[PDB]
Amino acid sequence: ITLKVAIYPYVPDPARFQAAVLDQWQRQEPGVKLEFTDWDSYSADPPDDLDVFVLDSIFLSHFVDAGYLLPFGSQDIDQAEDVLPFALQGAKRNGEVYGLPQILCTNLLFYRKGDLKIGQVDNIYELYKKIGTSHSEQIPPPQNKGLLINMAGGTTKASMYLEALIDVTGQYTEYDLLPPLDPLNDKVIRGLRLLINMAGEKPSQYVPEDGDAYVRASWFAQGSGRAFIGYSESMMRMGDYAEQVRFKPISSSAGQDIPLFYSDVVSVNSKTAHPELAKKLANVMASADTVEQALRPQADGQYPQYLLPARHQVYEALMQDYPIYSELAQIVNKPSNRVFRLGPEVRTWLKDAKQVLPEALG
Template identity: 40%
Template sequence: MGLGRVVASVGRSARTICCVALACLLWLPAAPPGWAQDRLTVALYPYVPRLAQFESAIRDAWAAKHPDVALTFADDWDGGYSDNPNDAYDVFVFDAMYFHYFRTQGYLDALAPDEIDDLDDLVAYARQGLEVDGSYYAVPLLGCGNMLFYHENNVALAAAETLGAVKAALGTCTYTSQVPPGPMGLTVDMAGGTTNATLYLDALHSDSGTYPPPLTPELDDEAIGDMRDMIRMASFYNATAEFPGAYDRQVEFSDGYGEATVGFTESLSQMSAETRATIAFKPLPISDQTGNPPLFYADVIAVNTKAEARGTRALAVDLVNVMAATDTVVAATGPAEPGGTPQYLMVNRTSAFEALAAIDPLYTPLHKLITDYDPLLFSLGADARTWVADNKAPIRAAVRANYACGCDYPSGQPIADNDDAQDICPGVCADHGAWTGQWTNQPPAAEGGSVCGCTVCPVAQAAQATGAR
């Protein structure tokens, strides 16, 4: 799509002959109702730790530049995972995995390079992934990737460059409860359908090096095997359960449950200061190949093509630049109050990383995730929406099939010791394979009672679980 501009057309002058004089009047057609340029509607990416902080930072920065143009923040946007942008949005922020889908569907207005402030300050992986034929159809705001978090004194995990090395360090089948009973094993969210689909494509790219990862109907056995290894390093329940909070697994890791956890960088905001003081992290080695760069996500800002027709395009482009400006990004992602905790989101401006590193030194290793690993943008083909919808359930079912580590089941009565377990657990596990010999009555592994470890997990039920990234 070429650059669009609104050209104000001038109607033909109407001559009116008066008895006193002749006047030449120039008539300008008025904009239709609702097309006023005193308000813009913006839809933010909703899955951040403190969305209200983004709204406040953007509103303040915008008011300083355009005090007479109000902002309305939409509350009905899911980041682009299943929704298309409402025609009323002037500007919207979405996950760039669907960049080519939205572009080919005609939702994204093209920006010339000189319309984007400080273009070269934007991080390369995201900036380059949004350019098509010399135009930019979105501007990077935030980034993220699947990170492996562990304690800095964990020498084995620090040295691990492959999934096999991570598995050797953590072991498999180390616990069967939803929450690890102590600092053992992995915790990882593989509950949602879209989460499974994106992890699969991440593993597929890591295994093959093909970019973008191919959206084929046949599932790749190696990539499925990589994901199965991740569940075995965790537990069936930990990996497949829908936890109440998006960062619950990282909170539990911070509290001493689990030896390592997989999450996005903003998970750091939910960990204790003591944990952050000894934390280490790196892109998750998701296969046994080491030569392919990791895929990083980006949340990107776009101008809706509908803005041009209602005469708000110029203001919308200005809003994109205000939202992506270093000062706005720092205010939106840093501490909400003096001495507070930053959101630890991966920003997409070099200058924003530098400004945030002056506030919190963790932003230096966060920046190195980009500079040291040279990632590629996680962006899929134009048919990504259809492929994800068709394949997320088969991927999830394939990953959960043939799980070999067993699961905990409530005993239905208290278990005080091994003698009680030998009397109770074989009956509990009669319909779930057999008893593994494991039991516990200690939280958090056993919340509200005792549990027995059985060899067969409720795979069929879990495969029906809902959820998306």
């Protein structure tokens, strides 16, 4: 038996995950071969022959309603009690768990050690009062000046829009019904513009020729910018500098805050010829052992991926050697945290959004 598996491609080091998964799989199922495939939920639906795969939960509702996924009964979930409650909950649809939470993600406010003033910033408007408007379009921003933030790509912007809208309304929603693109929410748009205003248009829209999703973190480590809003994983690219940065969650609104996290869950194809073996693999891929191994440096010169695990056990195990994970654990354990979910019509809404959001933002 050979199982076709696809790990989440948007991580600092995908190979560490593949290796982690293969090693952990072989320990309990050495006779079942794994064929790692490149599959992206952001630009593709599950192929009929892809047995197990990790997808971004914004696409969960669509995959489920389309009949692509195989649900996990409470019997098919290993150590559900160690999984973060909000993560496990964000993986449910139609009263069923449809994915095993493997990675959680959120932008964080990164600032430099001795910059106490940015340390007290809790939202983007408070951030603006400190750093103000960018006064240069150069890439990257001048040393210790402005905001570094990746706002390139239509889906990223669309995603930031939808997350901001939740905090603006003060009510969490899985967006079963996606919002109208006309009229756009002005507060949300003002929020996104404020960010662009702080970062600079070109710098915020920059996409490196090498497709490096973490280039702004390296710029930050080099001294560019005063503040940096990026994913926790950004710290791997910071290398030795990750210990010198300080970070903290940052809200897009001053009044209401519902911390939203992208959740990459391991799901099983409904068409898989090996349901139990596939469920077994999904569990291994989401196991505390596998995720810890994937995040930990696997060779000389490597740093932790600094990705956010969905299980307590990984934070418990990592923080001894990597104290940064103590702070990350704290953020992920906030009771108000929620998984960022989008309705079944996400793909269409995303296409529609890029025809209106870039104009609204300038």
